[model samples]
Target: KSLSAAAQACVKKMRDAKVNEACIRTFIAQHVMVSKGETGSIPDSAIMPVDSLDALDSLTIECDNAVLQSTVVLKLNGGLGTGMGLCDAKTLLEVKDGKTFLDFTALQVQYLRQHCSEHLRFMLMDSFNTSASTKSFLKARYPWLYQVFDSEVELMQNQVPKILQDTLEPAAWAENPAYEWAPPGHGDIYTALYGSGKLQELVEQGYRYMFVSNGDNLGATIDKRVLAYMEKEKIDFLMEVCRRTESDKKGGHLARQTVYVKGKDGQPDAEKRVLLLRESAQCPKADMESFQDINKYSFFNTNNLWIRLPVLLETMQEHGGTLPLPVIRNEKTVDSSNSASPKVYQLETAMGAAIAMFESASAIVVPRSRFAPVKTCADLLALRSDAYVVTDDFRLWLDDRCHGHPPVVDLDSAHYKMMNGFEKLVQHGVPSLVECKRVTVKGLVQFGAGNVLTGTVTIENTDSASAFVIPDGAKLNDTTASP
Candidate 1:
C-alpha cells in the first residue's frame, strides 16, 4: 500500500508536467524494486585497450556530403554553476579571452557553416532550471543561431520527483519545497528528445545523425573525417573514448561479456558476446582494487557520442517509448547540505550506458586534447592560462608553442578550491602560465595582470590570518615567494 500510494503520487506529478509516463513506470518497475545485488567486475578477457584500435588518422576516409547534410550537433547545456559559486548557467561564465563557453560554441558553429558552406544545425538540451534563462540569453546575444537552425533551438529535460528511500514516498522537505524534485542525469537526453517531439521533428525533416556532447567540453567538435568513417562503415552508434591515466581511473569504463545458450538439439549451444559499461559505484567493494587497475580498464567514456537517429527512434519504440538504461541509485538528503533533512533517492542514468542497447555500438580512441572539461576551479584556471590557446575558429587547443609538449599545471586546492575565492585572489587576471612548469599555492595568494611564471614557482602564505598578493608586472622564475 505504501509503495503503491507513493508511485501514484509520482505518476500524478509527472502527468501534471506532461512527462513521458512510459519512462516513469519503467523506472519504478525495473530500478526501484531491484535489490542491491553482489556487484560483479568484468574479467580481463572482456576488456580491450583503446590503443589496440586502428589509428584515427590512418583511416582513408573523406567527408561525405550526405552525412554532413543530415547531421545535427547537439550540446548538453543543462549544467548549473552552483559548484562554481554562481547561480546562473555555467556556459555563460567567461572561459577564454573574456568570451563565455557559449560564445566559443556559437563561433564554432558559425565558422563551420561559413567555411564548409553547409547548413549546419545546432541544438541544446537544457534542464528545467536552465532552459528559460539560456534561451533568452542566446536570442538576445547570438541571433545568428536562429538564422542557422531557423526554428526552436532548445529542448527541455523533464523533471522527476525524488523518492524518500525509507518509505518509498514522494520526498517532502518543509525547509525547501523546491528540493522535492531533481533533474535526472544526462541520460534524460534520449527521453527529452522524444518527449519534446524534437526527435520526430528532426526525423520528418530528414535529419539522420546526431553528435551529442557536453557544452562545457569546448574540445568537442564535429570532425568530418570521423563522420565519413561512420557513414562508410554503417555504424549505428559510436562513443569517443580516451586512454585512461591515473587521474581518470575512477570514471566509468567499457567492457564486454559473453553468454552461452542451449541449442534445439539439446547439446552445447552457440556463444554470444555483448558490450557493457560499468561505473565505479557498480563495482563491488571487495573488487575495488581490480576495478581501479588502470591496466584492466584502459579507456574512459568522453561523453562525446555519435548516433543514428533512425536507430535511436527504433530502440525507444521497441522499449515502449523509453530506453531501458541502467539505473544509478544515488542516496542523499532533501537539502544536500542539511543532515537533518529527509533522506531521498535520486534515480539517474548515464547516456554512454546506452552502448549496451545497440548491436553495432563501438568506441574510438581519441586524444586527450579532445577530453578537456572545466569541471572545477583547477580546470578553469588551466583552460584560461597560457597552457591553452584559442584557435581562429574559437576551438581551444593545447599550446604547441612550448616545445612539442603542453605545459603542465598544478594548483593547490586549499586556497583556490572555490570559484568565488579563486576569482577574488586573482583580481587583476590569471597570470600567464605559458612557460610555467609547476605552480603550488599553499594559502591565499593574488596574481596581478602581466605577471609571468616560468619553470617552477611556489607561493606560500605561512601566516594563517592574512592573504598574500603578487603585484602587477612581476616575473617569478625558479624561486619561492613567501608572505
Candidate 2:
C-alpha cells in the first residue's frame, strides 16, 4: 500500500512536468523493487570469473572503409562539473592548448572524415541540465560540426524524481524543486536513444555500428579495427575493459552466472550463462573480500562501448522499447550541495550493466591509455602538466617519457578543489611531470612552473593564511615540512 502511494505521487508529479511515460514506468518498477527490500546483489555462489577477453596487444583484426563509413561516434555528455565546483557542462572546461573536450571531439571528426570515412557521424547523449550549454559551446566554438548532420546531434537522457528517505515518497524542496529530481543514470541511454527514434533512423540510414565513450574520457579514441571486427562478427555489444590495479580495487568487476530463461509461448525454459557487472554498491558485507580480489576479478569495465545499431534496437523492442537493465539504488541526500538535507535514494543504472542484457556481448582488454579521464581537480592537474601530450592526430595520450605510468597527483582539496582555483595555481606553466612518479601537494602550496617533480615527491605548506609558491626550475624530491 505504501509503495503504491509513493508511485502514484511520483507519477503525478512527473506527468505534470511532462516526463517520458516509459521512463516513469521503469522508475516505478524500480521503486517497488527497492521498497520490497531487493538488494540487487550478486552472491558469491551465483558468479564465476570472466573466461577471457581479446587482449588488444596480441589481437590481429581486419579493417576496411566499408566498416568505417557505416560507423557513428557518441559521447555520454550527461555529467555536470559540480564535483569540481562548476555548474556548467564538464566538457566545456579547457583540456589543453586553450581547447575544450568539445574542440577535440570536433577535430577528431574532422580527422576521421579526411582519413577514415567522410560519412562517419558523431552525436552526444546530453542530460536536461547539460543539453543547452553543451550545444551552445559546440556551436560557438566549432561551427563546422553542424554541417553534415541531417539528424539531431543531441539525445536527452531522462530524469526521475528522487525518493525521500523518511517517507519513500518523491522528494520535495520548494526552494529549488529541481533538486527533487535526478538523471536515471547512463543506462538510460538505451531507452533515451530508443525514444528519440534515432536508433531506428540510424539503422534505416545504413549506419550499422556506434562507438561511445564518456565526454570526460579523452583516451577512448575510436579504432577502425575494433569497428570492423564488430560488423564482420555480428557482435551485439562489445565493452572495452582494462586490467585492474591496486588503485582500481573499488571499481565494478565483470562476472558471469547461469540464469534460467522462461521461454516464449511455453517453448522451454533453459539454463544459459550470461555476463554480469557487479559494482561496489552491489556487493554484500559477507562478499566484500571476494569482490575486491584483484587476482580473482582482474579486469574492469572502461565505459568505452561498441554496439550494433540494429541489434540494440531489436533487443529494446523485444523488451517493450526498453532494455531490462539492473537498477542501481544510490542513497544520498536529495540536495547534494547540502549534507544536512534529507537523505534520499536516486535509483540509477550503469550502461556497462547492459552486458548482461545481451546474449552476444563480449569484452576486450585494452591499455591504460584507453581509460584516461579527467574526473577531479587533481586529475585535471595531471592533464594540464607536461605528463600528457596532444598528438597531431588530435588525440590526448600519455607522454612516452612517463614510461606508461601517469604521475600520481594529490592536491589538497581545501585549497585546490574547484577548477577556477586550480587554474590560478597552474597559471605558472603546469609543473613538469615527465619524470615524476608521484606528486603530492598539501596545505596551500602552488607550483612555479618548469619544476620537475620526481619519485616520491611531497611539498607541504600548512599555513592557513599565506600561500607558498615553489620556486621556478626547482627539482623537489621528497621534501617534508616539520610538524
Candidate 3:
C-alpha cells in the first residue's frame, strides 16, 4: 500500500522522535482513514445492552495465587491533567494521607506482592509528557518500583504529529514545536506495549496476563475475583465495568453491536452479538438523549482491563503491529492556547474499544468500590473527607455510615475548583460527612473544624467579599444554613 504524502510526513515525525515502528504503523492506519475524511461514527441504532453479562456478586471463584503471579498490573499515567489546575502528572497529586496517587499504587503493588503472589509485576504506561517526571518521582520516592517491570517500570505512549486540516499533512510550528504533536489517547498502550519490546519481555518472564487501569482511579486496585474468573474462563480480554448512576450519565457505556458471521459464501447473514464501547464523542447528535440514559446503557468502563498477554502480542503481530480500532478524529487549532491558529486533525483511539476486536472479550460488572476517580475538586474533597474510608490495604471505600451510596458533594466550582483554593476554604478542617446524605455549598462558605453535617445540608454565603464559616462542632441536618 502506497502511503500518502501526509502519512509519510506523519511517519517521519514519529520516526524522528524515536517512536517504535508499531506506534508508527498505528498512526499510518488512522491516517489512512483521516486522510480520506472518515468521521469514525458509531450509530446509536447499531448498539444495545448485553443481556449475557453477569455481575461481580455472582462470581464465587476468586483469589488464586497462581493467577495473580502470572498477571502484570499496568497503570496508565499518561495524562498531564491540565484540567483541575495541574501542570504535571495528575497521579502526582495527593489524594489521601499526604500520599500521591503513585504512592498508593506502589503500596498496593507491595501489598499484593506480600499477600498474594511474590512475582506479581506492576508497570506504568506513561506518555513523553509524564514519563520523565513520573520516573523521577518513583526513583526519588519508591525506588523499588522505579526498577521493577521493565527495569524502568514504564511503557512509553506514542505522540503522533497533528495533521493540518487544509493540507492533510503534518503540522509544523517554529514558535512552539510541541503544538505539532499530540499523544494518541490511551489507545497507544497496545502499540507501546508491543513496540517497546516490553510485551515480549513479559512473555519471556512467564507472565500470562496484563491488567491495566487509569492511575488516577484509587479504587482500581487489583481484584482477585475478576482475575480468577478470567483465568478460569480462558478469557482473552476482560474489562471492569461499573453500573452507571446519574453521576456517570456523560461517560462512555458498554453495548453490543450486530456483526454478520460469514460462515459460507453467499449464505444468508447470521447476526452475531459483539460487545463494544460507545463513547459520548462517537454518539450521533440525535442520539445524545439515549446515550445519557443510564437505565438503557447501565454500565460504564472503568478502564480496568485484563488481557491475556500472548493474545495481545499475537493479535498485534497478525494485524501488522496495530489493532484495527475505530479512529477518533478531533479537529482543533495548531495552538490549543489560541483558537485563531491553523486548524489540525488529532486522530486518536481508546484502549477500551479493543473489546470489539477480540474473539473472547468479556466485561464484568464491578462494584462502585472499584471506580473512584478524582477528576475534580469535588471528587478529591469527597475522597479526602470522612465520607470514605481508605482501608489498611490502601483501597478507598464509601463509609458504611453513609448507607450504600457515596455522598453527593456540590462545592461551588467558582470558589473550589482549584486545589489550593479548595484547601484554603476547608483549611479549618475537612467536613464530617460519614452520616451525610448530600452536602451543597454555595458562595464563599468556609468550613470550620468539627462541622458535623448530617443528612442533606446546604451552606450558602452569597457574598464574595466576606467568608461565612460553619462553626466548630456545630451539627446541622436537613436544613439550609445561610449567613
Candidate 4:
C-alpha cells in the first residue's frame, strides 16, 4: 500500500468523526474514472423566467405572527479571508459605512428581536479554522448578546481528507500537514446539524423553520413575506434566485428534468419533471453555447435558502444518516500555487444542490438588492463607495441618487485584486462613485475621500512604476487622466 502511516491515521480519524464513507467513495470513483455526469445541457422548455412568475408584490399571503417565534436564522461562517490576504474570518472585513459584515449581521438579528418581539435564535456553522477566532471576537465585541446565548450560537463544520487523484490515497503534504485535509463544502450543514445534535435540539425546542444564508451577504436578512409565502405553500425547501445578468453567466442555474416511471399496469409513464441545480463545473464543454445563453438559464442561485426542520430531519433518517447530495469532484494540486505538486481531488457538494433531493422544493425570484455578496475586491469597493447606502437597520441598497440601476465598477485586477492592495490605493479613504456611470481604473490610482466622478471616467498610469492620485474633493467628468 502506497498510503503513508499518517494518511491511514487521517482516514480513520475522519471515519471516527462520523464522516459518511459512502459519499466519500462515490466521489473517489468519479475522480478515478474522470466522469462528471452527463454532458448534455437542459432543454428550453425546462427553464422558468422571473417575468413569468407572479410579481412579489402581488402575493396575498400574510405571515402568521405566531409562526415567527418558531423560526431560526443560520448563517454559514466558515470562510477564511485568504483571498483578501487575511488569515482571519472573511466576515470581519469592513464592508459598508465602516461596519464589518459581522457587525451588520448582529445588528440585523437585534433589530428583529426588538421590533418583531420574537425570540429569534441565531446560529453560525463555522469551520475549525474560524470557530475559535470568530467566537472570541463576537463574545468580546458584543458581550451583552453573547451573555444571552453563550456557546450555543456556534457549531463547527466537519473536515474531510483530500485524496491524491492518481493513487486514490489520502493526499499527503509532508511540508504542511494541514494541507492534507479540506473543509467539506457547506453541504455538510445538513450532516453537521445532525452530528452536532443541534437538529434534534431545534425540533425539541419547537423551531420548525430555518433560514440559512452566507455571513458575507448583508442583504440576506429574514423577509417576512418570503417566510409567509413558504408557510402558505407548505414548501419543504425554498431557494432564493435572482434574474441572471451577463456577469452571472458562469454561476449555477436552475433547471427541471423529466423522468419516466412505471404505471400500475406495468406500463411506463412520464411523471412531472423535478427542479435541479446545475453548476458551471457540471456543464459539458460541448454544451458551452447553450449553458452560456443567459435567456435559456434565466436565474442564478443567491445561496439564500429556507427549509422546514422536520422535513430535513426526516430526509436524513430515510437516506441512512446522510443527505444524498450530488458530489462535485474538483481536480487541483496539493499546493494550489504549485502545479508541479501531486494532483488531488477535493470532493465537495454545494448547499443548493440539495434542491433535487427534496420533494416539494421550489424557487422564488427576488430582486438584485437581496443578492449582494462581497466575494471580491470589486464588490467591496462598490459597497464602501457612495454608490451603495446602508440603511438604519443595516440592509444595503443602491443609493437613491443613482436612479435605479447600480453602477458598473471595474478595477484593474493586477493592482486592486486583493483587499490589502485596494485599501492602500484609497489611502485617504474610498471615493464617491454614486453619480458615475462606469469607472475603469487601469493604473495604480489613489482616491481621496469626497472625490466625485461623473459620467464615464478612466484613470490610467502612463508609467508602469508610478501611481496617480486623485486629491480629495476633485471632480472628474468624461475624462481620461494620467499623473
Q: Which residue segments of model 2 deviate by more than 4 Å?
A: 1-5, 35-37, 146-151, 165-168, 262-269, 336-343, 454-456, 462-465, 475-483
Give a tens-digit lDDT track for model 4, residues 1-483.
Answer: 344444555557567657655444333333434333433344445544333443355666768656778888898889988876778888888887667888888888878777774678888878877877777778878775566444568877776777777656778798987787776688878877877678888988988889999998878988888878887888899998887888788777877766555577867666655677888677767666777678877887889999999899898788766676666667888888878988987777789988878878888888777888777787888788889877777677788888877767788888888777888787787778898888898888888767888889888886967667776778888978787
Alpha-carbon RMSD of each model? 3.4, 3.0, 2.3, 4.1
Worst 10 residues of 4 by lDDT: 30-39
> C-alpha displacement of 248 in model 2, angstroms?
1.7
Candidate with the larger lDDT of 3 and 4: 3
| Ranking of all predicted structures according to TM-score, beginning with the best and ending with the worst | 3, 2, 1, 4
Worst 10 residues of 3 by lDDT: 143-152
C-alpha lDDT (0 to 100) for residue 342 of candidate 4: 84
lDDT of 4: 0.76
Separate clash counts for every candidate: 0, 0, 0, 0
Q: Please, what are the lDDT tens digits per residue for candidate 2 over residues 174-275?
A: 778889988888888877778777888899999888888999998888887687667666778999899889789888888878888787896877899887
On a 0 to 1 TM-score scale, where does candidate 4 land against the true structure? 0.88
Best by TM-score: 3
Q: Rate the local accuracy (lDDT) of all candidates.
A: 0.76, 0.82, 0.83, 0.76
Estimate candidate 2's alpha-carbon lDDT, on a 0 to 1 scale. Answer: 0.82
Task: Look at candidate 1 and give me any clashing residue pairs.
Answer: none
| Candidate 3 deviant stretches above 4 angstroms | 148-152, 261-271
Instruction: Give me the candidate number with maximum lDDT.
Output: 3
